[PDB]
Amino acid sequence: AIGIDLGTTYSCVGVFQHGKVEIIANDQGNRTTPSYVAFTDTERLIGDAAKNQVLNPQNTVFDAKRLIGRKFGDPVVQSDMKHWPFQVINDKPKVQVSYKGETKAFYPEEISSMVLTKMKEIAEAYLGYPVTNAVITVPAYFNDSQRQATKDAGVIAGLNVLRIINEPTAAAIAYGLDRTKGERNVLIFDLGGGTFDVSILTIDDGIFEVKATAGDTHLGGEDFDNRLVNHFVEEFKRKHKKDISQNKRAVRRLRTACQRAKKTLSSSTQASLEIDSLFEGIDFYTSITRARFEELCSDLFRSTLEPVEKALRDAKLDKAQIHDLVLVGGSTRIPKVQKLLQDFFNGRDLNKSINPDEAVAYGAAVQAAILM
């Protein structure tokens, strides 16, 4: 049995074999896989292949997790639509694309079943035998419709879903927090590529209970990337009196450079950007300090403590009553994010020894093996 983190922008599969969890690399050596499905004139693409060619915006589906289990009427759905390059329709939302010369329509769980099919075959390549049993995780705030449609996606992918479990719960499991006895309050701080969730759980003799959930479904690492891109678009304007914004390729190349610089600023205090012939044949060689990055992202950083306080408020718990702080999602690697959380909790330690990109898949694989 495997554990699958079916994330908004990225998915991760793990397996418990030989006393240990392996997080499994896809074909490209990537241990997380984009939650993207793409339909072309000749083929269906999933994951790494799909996100790359996103050239094909109307037929490259992403963010299915935002749709899954929701009604077309749901304000969330009506609002997310406007920023999707692909069509949506009532059937119940469905995504509509062109595939092999024809218009096709998929429910969100059909799209997510294809991403799960990828995660399944990734696991099977590694294991050297077929996989059928799986635990899939969801945000704690997901309702029963969202959980059912997520489970259905797993079934469609040919999986027997042992359990739908909460992502913060999976994260806790990954750290063995559920096998310590007495009673324990755990705060999961989950800042992903596209979403931010704060969950407080109580663990009692191994039993879980969600006490509070807060966050921002439209706040993540990609927002921090955006701050950097706009900053450098402006820096380029100032320096060269040209606007690269209208050239798609320049923006993309700048964006990937910013993604690289943001990664670098998590382990270094400065990052260099070097782009040959970015625009109008002008090479763009520049740099940014971590401090400059943090400043440009000031509001975003401030946005993260608010759901923390509200979570505490809803759970009727004080700071000191939290026994464990768990870091999930790649962007929790950002130093300023960790400091802001740790400071708020009076210098407490952060559970971060597990790859924050992989903690949820890790936990789901542990749970899968327990249920087996």
Interaction site with Cl ion (CB under 5 A): 7-8, 192, 195
Candidates 22, 110, 178, 190; catalytic one: 190
Pairing mode, strands 196-204 and 33-34: unpaired
User: Two tokens at 123?
Assistant: 């696991």
User: Two tokens at 360?
Assistant: 């949820």
Cβ 355 to Cl ion shortest distance, Å: 16
Candidates 63, 109, 167, 358; catalytic one: 167
| 65 part of the active site | yes
Cβ(245)–Cβ(232) below 8 Å: no
> Closest residue to Cl ion, Cβ-based?
8
Tell me how far CA of residue 224 lies from CA of 90, 178, 265, 284, 296, in angstroms.
33, 33, 12, 20, 9
Closer to Cl ion by CB, 250 or 361: give it.
361
| 263 part of the active site | no
User: Could you give the angle at which helices 221-240 and 298-315 cross, rounded to 10 degrees?
Assistant: 160
Cβ count near 298 (within 10 Å): 11
Tell me how far CA of residue 200 lies from CA of 141, 308, 351, 352, in angstroms.
11, 9, 14, 17
CA distance 323 to 203: 10
Cβ(139)–Cβ(167) below 8 Å: yes
Candidates 22, 51, 63, 65; catalytic one: 65
User: Two tokens at 222?
Assistant: 């990609």
| 190 part of the active site | yes
| 357 part of the active site | no
Closer to Cl ion by CB, 93 or 221: give it.
221
Residue from 11, 20, 4, 2 nearest 133 by CA: 2
Cβ 146 to Cl ion shortest distance, Å: 12
Cβ(30)–Cβ(330) below 8 Å: no
Please give the positions annotated as active site: 5, 65, 167, 190
